Structure formats: C-alpha cells, structure tokens
Amino acid sequence: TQQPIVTGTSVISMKYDNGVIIAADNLGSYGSLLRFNGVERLIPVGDNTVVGISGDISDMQHIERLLKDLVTENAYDNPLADAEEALEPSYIFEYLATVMYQRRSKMNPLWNAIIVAGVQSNGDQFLRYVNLLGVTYSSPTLATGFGAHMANPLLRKVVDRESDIPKTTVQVAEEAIVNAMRVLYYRDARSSRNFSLAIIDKNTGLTFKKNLQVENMKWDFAKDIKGYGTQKI
Amino acid sequence: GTGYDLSNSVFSPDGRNFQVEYAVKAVENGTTSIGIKCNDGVVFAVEKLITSKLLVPQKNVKIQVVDRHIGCVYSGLIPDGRHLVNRGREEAASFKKLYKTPIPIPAFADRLGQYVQAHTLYNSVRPFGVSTIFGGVDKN
C-alpha cells in the first residue's frame, strides 16, 4: 500500500472509423505544485499501440520499462517479430491488466489509470482501460480521472454508441479530443496547456504529435465580472 | 593412476580438466560457424546442414539475439547453446535494469565467460558442449 507523489492527470481517448485517438497533457504534478512540464505520458509500443498513463509518475516510468522489455523479449527467437508475430495491442493490454490485478491483489498497487489504444492486425480498433484496482472495461470513448467527468460527455456526443464509429472521421474525432483538452485546461487544476496526441490508423499507421497547445480560449468575458454579488466597480 | 577424466572438476596430473577437453570434441564435431569484425559492426554466419528435403527451408534458425544489440552463434550441442543464450539474456536484462544503459560487449562477454567457467568448477555439472561466437556495437 502506498500513496502517489508525482502525478499525471487525465488521459482521454476515443475510436473513429479507421482507428483510435488518445491524448494526455505533459504535466507532472507534485500535490498542488505544477513541478514538471516535459512529461510524456503516451507510451508508444511498436507501431500499432499507444499506452496512455495517469497517476503516479514513478510507477508510470516502471510500466514504461516493462513495455520496453516486452518488446525486447518478443523479439527473441522470433523471426516474425515485425510481422505475424509482432506485439498486438490486445497482448500489451492483457499483460498490463494481469500485472495491475496481481499488484492490487498483493496489496501493493501500481497507482495508475491506463488506457491502451491501438489497431489489431485484422484492422479492428482497440481501446480498453485498466487501473490500480485491476478493473477493466471498453467503450467507444474512454477517459481517466477528470477526463471521465468532462471529456466523456463531450466525446460521447460524437460517438454515443457502437454504430457511430464508422460514421466518424479522423477530423471530427481529433477535433473532439482537442476541444476536450481545452475544457480540461479550463476546469482541471492539475492540468497543463501543453499535451501530446497520437492517432493509430489502420491505413496511415501511427502518428505521434508532440508539443501541442490549447488554443482559441475564451477569457475576454472575465473583464465584465466584478465583485461576488453586490459590488459594481 | 587413471580415471582423472571421469569427474568434471578433477585436475589430471598434468594440470588439465579432461571433461572440458572432451566437451571440445563435441564442439569440433559440430557445424562450422564464424564471425567477421568489420569497421563499424560485426557479421555472424553459420552452416545449416540439410538432413533432408523435409526440413522447411529458412525455418530452423540458429543465430540468436541478446537484448537488441548482441548477436550469438555457436557450434556443438545446440541445446547447450540455447541454454547459454538464455543466461546471457537474463544477464543483460539484469545489467540494463540497474545501469539503464544496454550492456557493453566486453561486459557481456565476461558474463558468459564467468557462467561457463563456473561449469568447470564442480562434478555435479557438465561443461558446455559449445564454442560461441558473439558480439555487437556499443558505446565505443
């Protein structure tokens, strides 16, 4: 049993017609101190999977090392490591989920919320979540922490049920995710303006975008607001 | 007297360890394999005797990789060679885990070396029946 020290906030994601999108800001908080700003919380594994991690950063770095090893190990005595026998997103997830539940079961959890996004070899979109309790689930959209409360409502307006996936384009999707990142920047006190976004498309492959920024923010109306009730000036 | 060649760690009167020498025979009796060091890397290659038309071509691979920068090839008792690579792989994983940097070739060589030398120290184990050629590119 432990407690998180350096942490990462929300990880939002959703799936569109050709793949999945996943994003996460680059902040590493320490309580209320916005301590680190160059923290990448999207872990790419191979070219068909991206792992977004939130929670304890030290545990995240550990999960990161686990993933690099999974890659190294899978390549051993594997002449099809870059083809038929490459790491599938579902493999990567089942592994991490196994680890997460074993750890909570030993009363010493990896204090995280993880979302594995990717495209299977048969083209199917893969999006599943797992946290420190070992709990897992899938949905057309998935977000952790604050994003669960604010991002899901927005993203679910684009893809409310399964049938909405094929009808959703990379543009519509990426737009929804980028707007969500802005909303979270407005109301999540442990969020940063800078973030990374990744798209895994069954045709274009893996596109990893770094250093994005929330833009087009409305702040002007603030000038018209004075006092907290009866004050006029 | 005699019998100095029946137990593995025993020194013969002339200071030799016959079991290791007999292990060598098993090596010389095996396929030929080589390694060529070039100006910025190394090349490994081996002979793969085709017992029959039944062997699926290109499938029974012999060269083995350790970590992501090391290559290993050996001649002799193949199963022993795999065993030695399995060890090297752990040895490498352990090193990376503590020092972060993937294991330097020299460092890796001794890891394999010490482990092999270890199997010439007791009579409860057999020496490795393989000579192994391995290498890679590192920090320098």
Swiss-Prot record, chain A:
Q: Where does the protein end up?
A: Cytoplasm; Nucleus
Where does this chain mainly localize?
cytoplasm
Under the heading PROSITE patterns, the entry gives:
PROTEASOME_BETA_1, PROTEASOME_BETA_2
- Which GO terms of type biological process are on file? proteasomal ubiquitin-independent protein catabolic process; proteasome assembly; proteasome-mediated ubiquitin-dependent protein catabolic process
UniProt-listed Pfam families: Proteasome (PF00227)
InterPro entries the record matches: Ntn_hydrolases_N (IPR029055), Proteasome_beta4 (IPR016295), Proteasome_bsu_CS (IPR016050), Proteasome_sua/b (IPR001353), Proteasome_suB-type (IPR023333)
Q: Name one GO cellular component term.
A: proteasome complex
Tell me which UniProt keywords the record has, alphabetically.
Cytoplasm, Nucleus, Proteasome
State the function annotated in the UniProt record. Answer: Non-catalytic component of the proteasome which degrades poly-ubiquitinated proteins in the cytoplasm and in the nucleus. It is essential for the regulated turnover of proteins and for the removal of misfolded proteins. The proteasome is a multicatalytic proteinase complex that is characterized by its ability to cleave peptides with Arg, Phe, Tyr, Leu, and Glu adjacent to the leaving group at neutral or slightly basic pH. It has an ATP-dependent proteolytic activity. PRE3 and PRE4 are necessary for the peptidyl-glutamyl-peptide-hydrolyzing activity.
- Cite any additional comment in the entry: Present with 16900 molecules/cell in log phase SD medium.
Tell me which family the UniProt entry assigns to this protein. Answer: Belongs to the peptidase T1B family.
How does the record describe its quaternary structure? The 26S proteasome consists of a 20S proteasome core and two 19S regulatory subunits. The 20S proteasome core is composed of 28 subunits that are arranged in four stacked rings, resulting in a barrel-shaped structure. The two end rings are each formed by seven alpha subunits, and the two central rings are each formed by seven beta subunits. The catalytic chamber with the active sites is on the inside of the barrel. Interacts with CIC1.
Q: What is this protein called?
A: Proteasome subunit beta type-7
Please give the organism: Saccharomyces cerevisiae (strain ATCC 204508 / S288c)
* Encoding gene per record: PRE4
Curated annotation (Swiss-Prot), chain B:
Location in the cell:
Cytoplasm; Nucleus
What does the UniProt PTM comment say about this protein? The alpha and beta forms are probably products of the same gene with different post-translational modifications.
**Superkingdom of origin organism:** Eukaryota
Q: What else is known?
A: Present with 12000 molecules/cell in log phase SD medium.
Quaternary structure, per UniProt, is: The 26S proteasome consists of a 20S proteasome core and two 19S regulatory subunits. The 20S proteasome core is composed of 28 subunits that are arranged in four stacked rings, resulting in a barrel-shaped structure. The two end rings are each formed by seven alpha subunits, and the two central rings are each formed by seven beta subunits. The catalytic chamber with the active sites is on the inside of the barrel.
Q: What does this protein do?
A: The proteasome degrades poly-ubiquitinated proteins in the cytoplasm and in the nucleus. It is essential for the regulated turnover of proteins and for the removal of misfolded proteins. The proteasome is a multicatalytic proteinase complex that is characterized by its ability to cleave peptides with Arg, Phe, Tyr, Leu, and Glu adjacent to the leaving group at neutral or slightly basic pH. It has an ATP-dependent proteolytic activity.
Q: Which family does it belong to?
A: Belongs to the peptidase T1A family.
Write the protein's name.
Answer: Probable proteasome subunit alpha type-7
Q: Which organism is it from?
A: Saccharomyces cerevisiae (strain ATCC 204508 / S288c)
Lineage, broadest ranks:
Eukaryota, Fungi, Dikarya, Ascomycota, Saccharomycotina
